[PDB]
Design a protein around this nucleic acid. Structure first.
Ligand SMILES: [Mg+2]
Ligand SMILES: [Mg+2]
Ligand SMILES: [Mg+2]
Ligand SMILES: [Mg+2]
Ligand SMILES: [Mg+2]
Ligand SMILES: [Mg+2]
Ligand SMILES: [Mg+2]
Ligand SMILES: [Mg+2]
Ligand SMILES: [Mg+2]
Ligand SMILES: [Mg+2]
Ligand SMILES: [Mg+2]
Ligand SMILES: [Mg+2]
Ligand SMILES: [Mg+2]
Ligand SMILES: [Mg+2]
Ligand SMILES: [Mg+2]
Ligand SMILES: [Mg+2]
Ligand SMILES: [Mg+2]
Ligand SMILES: [Mg+2]
Ligand SMILES: [Mg+2]
Ligand SMILES: [Mg+2]
Ligand SMILES: [Mg+2]
Ligand SMILES: [Mg+2]
Ligand SMILES: [Mg+2]
Ligand SMILES: [Mg+2]
Ligand SMILES: [Mg+2]
Ligand SMILES: [Mg+2]
Ligand SMILES: [Mg+2]
Ligand SMILES: [Mg+2]
Ligand SMILES: [Mg+2]
Ligand SMILES: [Mg+2]
Ligand SMILES: [Mg+2]
Ligand SMILES: [Mg+2]
Ligand SMILES: [Mg+2]
Ligand SMILES: [Mg+2]
Ligand SMILES: [Mg+2]
Ligand SMILES: [Mg+2]
Ligand SMILES: [Mg+2]
Ligand SMILES: [Mg+2]
Ligand SMILES: [Mg+2]
Ligand SMILES: [Mg+2]
Ligand SMILES: [Mg+2]
Ligand SMILES: [Mg+2]
Ligand SMILES: [Mg+2]
Ligand SMILES: [Mg+2]
Ligand SMILES: [Mg+2]
Ligand SMILES: [Mg+2]
Ligand SMILES: [Mg+2]
Ligand SMILES: [Mg+2]
Ligand SMILES: [Mg+2]
Ligand SMILES: [Mg+2]
Ligand SMILES: [Mg+2]
Ligand SMILES: [Mg+2]
Ligand SMILES: [Mg+2]
Ligand SMILES: [Mg+2]
Ligand SMILES: [Mg+2]
Ligand SMILES: [Mg+2]
Ligand SMILES: [Mg+2]
Ligand SMILES: [Mg+2]
Ligand SMILES: [Mg+2]
Ligand SMILES: [Mg+2]
Ligand SMILES: [Mg+2]
Ligand SMILES: [Mg+2]
Ligand SMILES: [Mg+2]
Ligand SMILES: [Mg+2]
Ligand SMILES: [Mg+2]
Ligand SMILES: [Mg+2]
Ligand SMILES: [Mg+2]
Ligand SMILES: [Mg+2]
Ligand SMILES: [Mg+2]
Ligand SMILES: [Mg+2]
Ligand SMILES: [Mg+2]
Ligand SMILES: [Mg+2]
Ligand SMILES: [Mg+2]
Ligand SMILES: [Mg+2]
Ligand SMILES: [Mg+2]
Ligand SMILES: [Mg+2]
Ligand SMILES: [Mg+2]
Ligand SMILES: [Mg+2]
Ligand SMILES: [Mg+2]
Ligand SMILES: [Mg+2]
Ligand SMILES: [Mg+2]
Ligand SMILES: [Mg+2]
Ligand SMILES: [Mg+2]
Ligand SMILES: [Mg+2]
Ligand SMILES: [Mg+2]
Ligand SMILES: [Mg+2]
Ligand SMILES: [Mg+2]
Ligand SMILES: [Mg+2]
Ligand SMILES: [Mg+2]
Ligand SMILES: [Mg+2]
Ligand SMILES: [Mg+2]
Ligand SMILES: [Mg+2]
Ligand SMILES: [Mg+2]
Ligand SMILES: [Mg+2]
Ligand SMILES: [Mg+2]
Ligand SMILES: [Mg+2]
Ligand SMILES: [Mg+2]
Lengths: 46, 95, 271
RNA sequence: UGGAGGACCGAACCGACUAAUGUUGAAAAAUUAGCGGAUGACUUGUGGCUGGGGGUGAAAGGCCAAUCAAACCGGGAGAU
RNA sequence: GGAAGACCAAGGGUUCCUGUCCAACGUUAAUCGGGGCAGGGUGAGUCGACCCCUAAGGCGAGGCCGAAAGGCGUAGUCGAUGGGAAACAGGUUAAUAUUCCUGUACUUGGUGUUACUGCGAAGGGGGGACGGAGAAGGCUAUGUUGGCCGGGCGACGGUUGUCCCGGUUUAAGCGUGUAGGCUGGUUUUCCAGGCAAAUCCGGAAAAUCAAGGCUGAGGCGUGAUGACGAGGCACUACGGUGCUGAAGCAACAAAUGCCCUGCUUCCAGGAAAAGCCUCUAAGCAUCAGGUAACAUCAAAUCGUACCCCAAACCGACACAGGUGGUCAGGUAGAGAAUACCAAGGCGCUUGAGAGAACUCGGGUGAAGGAACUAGGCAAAAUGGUGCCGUAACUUCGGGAGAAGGCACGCUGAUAUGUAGGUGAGGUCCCUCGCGGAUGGAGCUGAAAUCAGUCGAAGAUACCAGCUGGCUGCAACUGUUUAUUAAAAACACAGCACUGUGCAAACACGAAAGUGGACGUAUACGGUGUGACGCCUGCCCGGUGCCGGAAGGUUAAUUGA
């Protein structure tokens, strides 16, 4: 039936995109944790 | 425009059946150009370097394919293609 | 014209609608209009601070003049309009000099009526003036509580205030709620009453109607679970407690008025 | 003459009343045959808002990512 | 086949097209593929994004607030799902085309000339600019028949005829100004209301004229001696290439598309802002700048393949599920239901036999007809259109499609096709036209009645109510336990209590602030009851709430 993931790009990027993280203290802490674990990509970007 | 930029625009002739077709029938040549060059600069650069008259330059961007080498997934680089219209006037040849 | 409907469908049965034939059919006066957005009864935290609001038809804010401060310049009533923003009707009036303003439409008002505001104005309904110049005992609406602020009291349809006392700087009013309140005599008021007093007669007849008016359903507390309300579940139909608001404060008789500022003004409570 | 309605019959559309099949399914809630609304308290697209001692609830403790009488992830933590 | 077709948006990201290969992948083989490897493929001033403008909402200099982080918000600045300039037909690729080519156009800017000239904004005013329902008149897409043109006399009786098949296509633009809708016009004087200014808007006063302006589908003309065009003639690697090219009209029906953001009506009273038009302030005056015609240049960048009712998106799979917008052929039909077909796409990626029990999905049944069973569960039956007929009870609307019954095919006549619908030719009129009247050829075309005829059966299929009687509860339409409960639960219109005087109670926030509301006691919140009709009796001892301050009692504080 209608499942849980109905994808949208504009949605995806406003919610989790780079800039969206950088907006806030918490977000920059996420990006800190990721850079510390050494991910391939931090956020969802194209 | 500066000439120094110009000589950096045009990478290579594009060779294929479509290419040959337009070159023969419509009097048009096909170029791989630097990803960032524009219709202005390509008009300039052909008119300058091959010294022949350009009518108009149409362009497109080719997304490189995705390949596998030994299980590894690589991505062929993008690039820009330019259809370059010459007026019926000039005749450009292969010696 | 208050009229019942022939019941051609169960919904239509109890409907009483109030048809004022004198109202303007066709668009309002545009330069006097504003944009208005419905809030869903939600504050700047997006929470619902006031339940039971939302949906409703779209409305445009008519800019109504409550200060009536354009003075000593006659104005005549062009037409009566329906205001979705309030109970009462309104009037589109034309001051001699070429300005138009909306006002609250008082009783006895109809197209063609000369009115005016200022200290000097004649006493007839739809005229405004500071209240020390008003005959004691007279009936008025659109009353200010502070000089120059604009009207606040008795803006609803059919409402009005009776002026029962003049003493020094303070006139005493009998408010529509039945409560005697002092207001400084320098506050302008407007003669007569608010019209469309039959507003209160009209019956909706069907839930849908209330839902057009921007009113969403109301869940009886004692229907909910004990977690959601103090009134709480029970087995079948069970009450057991004294009635309270959802936040636990006692309702049905508890006085919640507390101000010590405004006290010196209030003579006596309504009863 | 006129064209009111949470009006009527009825497809798309919305829904889920019964029956059977399915129950290591074609499907982690469906199918087939019938059933209710279908100009409205309707339905649906795109975007936004409300965040867990909270939301939201035409109120079933329902709903918040197939997890809800207090979500999820990391920590206290090798809780006991 | 209102899709299992065609086109998009989303989402995917090369799956597109060619060659080549068959291990793995594909529920079997696979020489095939959406699999592997290599190559090719996406061409824009006018289609989108960008860009200009704002909605909700977000961020937010100063600012207010807050232990810190931070919260709120002003000027701003972002944010489309909305408003903002302009391109069409044909031809072409193995794969793009409104982009390439042929033709024919269009818009906005820059410079230039020339003629004329009061131009200037973040300010002013208009415009942009807005609901539901309804009605029906004008049309067009489109279709059917006829004329026309090309071909056909046909595997079997009959077919040179009232016979058969196929075609009968043509756009934006530009000129024209029609069915319709809206609105009096023009000139002069005054007024300061439009935050300052105004010659513009609004207001007042005369003067004068009756047609004036605005809007507008479609038609007609051009576009077009052009294109497309059944086919035929040449060559062909048999895949195609080249040449040539008939007719290309008329009547009728007709949208849910357009006129129409219109018109009529209702109440629940129906976005904002910029481009756009005009008024002027600071200003600048032979400069500048504006208006028109011709010339001239520019129009950047990004998306463009393919899939989108799905084997490519969301479901772990090539998954019987889920996904918004657009187009809408024929005969029958009220119809976008249904049945059969067209354009077009498919045969659902294991078959081959056999023809047991049993299970699934169906079809049929003697005699009986609920005797079954928790229960007529399921099945059967009803089923359409017109006409006739219809009860208790009723809130006078209903109940009611109550119930029940009758005709229903074909052929002929009334009429070689009627009533209607459309309306040619002609004649007359004209303020001469896309005009008016007359006019009735052609074309279309119900319904009925009478006479005949076939069958067991004519609403022959698909399609398409089971009905009636008594009673519980709930007034009613709605809403609900996504995934065992749709109800008698919830809501409900209404009723009552009570709170609240506006800096409202209340609610969210340590606070600022916000909602309540740009509302104001005919308002707003809370609780209960739940249409309508009849009514709502007793009790203040208990808990609660409201009023009272006399006494008795009592906290910090002060310290005899
Ligand atoms: Mg070009
Ligand atoms: Mg491009
Ligand atoms: Mg690379
Ligand atoms: Mg806000
Ligand atoms: Mg309320
Ligand atoms: Mg309101
Ligand atoms: Mg209520
Ligand atoms: Mg309950
Ligand atoms: Mg809760
Ligand atoms: Mg409690
Ligand atoms: Mg209960
Ligand atoms: Mg009980
Ligand atoms: Mg849905
Ligand atoms: Mg549901
Ligand atoms: Mg079904
Ligand atoms: Mg149905
Ligand atoms: Mg019904
Ligand atoms: Mg129905
Ligand atoms: Mg909506
Ligand atoms: Mg709900
Ligand atoms: Mg869940
Ligand atoms: Mg919790
Ligand atoms: Mg808890
Ligand atoms: Mg510990
Ligand atoms: Mg342990
Ligand atoms: Mg221990
Ligand atoms: Mg069908
Ligand atoms: Mg979507
Ligand atoms: Mg894409
Ligand atoms: Mg691949
Ligand atoms: Mg392929
Ligand atoms: Mg291949
Ligand atoms: Mg295999
Ligand atoms: Mg095999
Ligand atoms: Mg093999
Ligand atoms: Mg492949
Ligand atoms: Mg465009
Ligand atoms: Mg804003
Ligand atoms: Mg700051
Ligand atoms: Mg902020
Ligand atoms: Mg912006
Ligand atoms: Mg954007
Ligand atoms: Mg858009
Ligand atoms: Mg746009
Ligand atoms: Mg293609
Ligand atoms: Mg403006
Ligand atoms: Mg609009
Ligand atoms: Mg209207
Ligand atoms: Mg036609
Ligand atoms: Mg012949
Ligand atoms: Mg006209
Ligand atoms: Mg040909
Ligand atoms: Mg439609
Ligand atoms: Mg439509
Ligand atoms: Mg393309
Ligand atoms: Mg395409
Ligand atoms: Mg779909
Ligand atoms: Mg499809
Ligand atoms: Mg899939
Ligand atoms: Mg398959
Ligand atoms: Mg599928
Ligand atoms: Mg759907
Ligand atoms: Mg059809
Ligand atoms: Mg028909
Ligand atoms: Mg078929
Ligand atoms: Mg076929
Ligand atoms: Mg297909
Ligand atoms: Mg069987
Ligand atoms: Mg049977
Ligand atoms: Mg039998
Ligand atoms: Mg029998
Ligand atoms: Mg019997
Ligand atoms: Mg037995
Ligand atoms: Mg029995
Ligand atoms: Mg049954
Ligand atoms: Mg049956
Ligand atoms: Mg009955
Ligand atoms: Mg005949
Ligand atoms: Mg005939
Ligand atoms: Mg006739
Ligand atoms: Mg006639
Ligand atoms: Mg017989
Ligand atoms: Mg018979
Ligand atoms: Mg009983
Ligand atoms: Mg009910
Ligand atoms: Mg009752
Ligand atoms: Mg119901
Ligand atoms: Mg359930
Ligand atoms: Mg159920
Ligand atoms: Mg507080
Ligand atoms: Mg406060
Ligand atoms: Mg507000
Ligand atoms: Mg109240
Ligand atoms: Mg109840
Ligand atoms: Mg007591
Ligand atoms: Mg007592
Ligand atoms: Mg007390």
């Amino acid at each position: 039936m209608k499942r849980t993931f109905q994808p949208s790009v504009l949605k995806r990027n406003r919610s989790h995109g780079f800039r969206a993280r950088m907006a806030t203290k918490n977000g920059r802490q996420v990006l800190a944790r990721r850079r510390a674990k050494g991910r391939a990509r931090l956020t969802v970007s194209k | 425009i500066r000439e120094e930029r110009l000589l950096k625009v045009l990478r290579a002739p594009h060779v294929s059946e479509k290419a040959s077709t337009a070159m023969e029938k419509s009097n048009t040549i096909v170029l791989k150009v630097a990803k960032d060059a524009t219709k202005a600069e390509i008009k300039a650069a052909v008119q300058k370097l091959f010294e022949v008259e350009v009518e108009v330059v149409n362009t497109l961007v080719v997304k490189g394919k995705v390949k596998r080498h030994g299980q590894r997934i690589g991505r062929r680089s993008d690039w820009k293609k330019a259809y370059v219209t010459l007026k019926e006037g000039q005749n450009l040849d292969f010696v | 014209a208050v009229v019942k409907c022939k019941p051609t469908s169960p919904g239509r049965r109890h409907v009483v609608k109030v048809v004022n034939p004198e109202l303007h059919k066709g668009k309002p006066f545009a330069p006097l209009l504003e944009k208005n957005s419905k809030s869903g009864g939600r504050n700047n935290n997006g929470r619902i601070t006031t339940r039971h609001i939302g949906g409703g038809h779209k409305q445009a804010y008519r800019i109504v003049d409550f200060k009536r401060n354009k003075d000593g310049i006659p104005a005549v009533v062009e037409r009566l309009e329906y205001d979705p923003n309030r109970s009462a009707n309104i009037a589109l009036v034309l001051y001699k000099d070429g300005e138009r303003r909306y006002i609250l439409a008082p009783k006895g008002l109809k197209a063609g009526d000369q009115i005016q505001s200022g200290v000097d104005a004649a006493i007839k309904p739809g005229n405004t003036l500071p209240m020390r110049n008003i005959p004691v005992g007279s009936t008025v609406h659109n009353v200010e509580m502070k000089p120059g602020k604009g009207g606040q009291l008795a803006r609803s349809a059919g409402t009005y205030v009776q002026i029962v006392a003049r003493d020094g700087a303070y006139v005493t009013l009998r408010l529509r709620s039945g409560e005697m309140r002092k207001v400084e005599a320098d506050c302008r008021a407007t003669l007569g009453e608010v019209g469309n007093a039959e507003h209160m007669l009209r019956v909706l007849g069907k839930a849908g109607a209330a839902r057009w008016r921007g009113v969403r359903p109301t869940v009886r507390g004692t229907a909910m679970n004990p977690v959601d309300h103090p009134h709480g579940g029970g087995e079948g139909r069970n009450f057991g407690k004294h009635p309270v608001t959802p936040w636990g404060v006692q309702t049905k008789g508890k006085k919640t008025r507390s101000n010590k500022r405004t006290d010196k003004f209030i003579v006596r409570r309504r009863s």
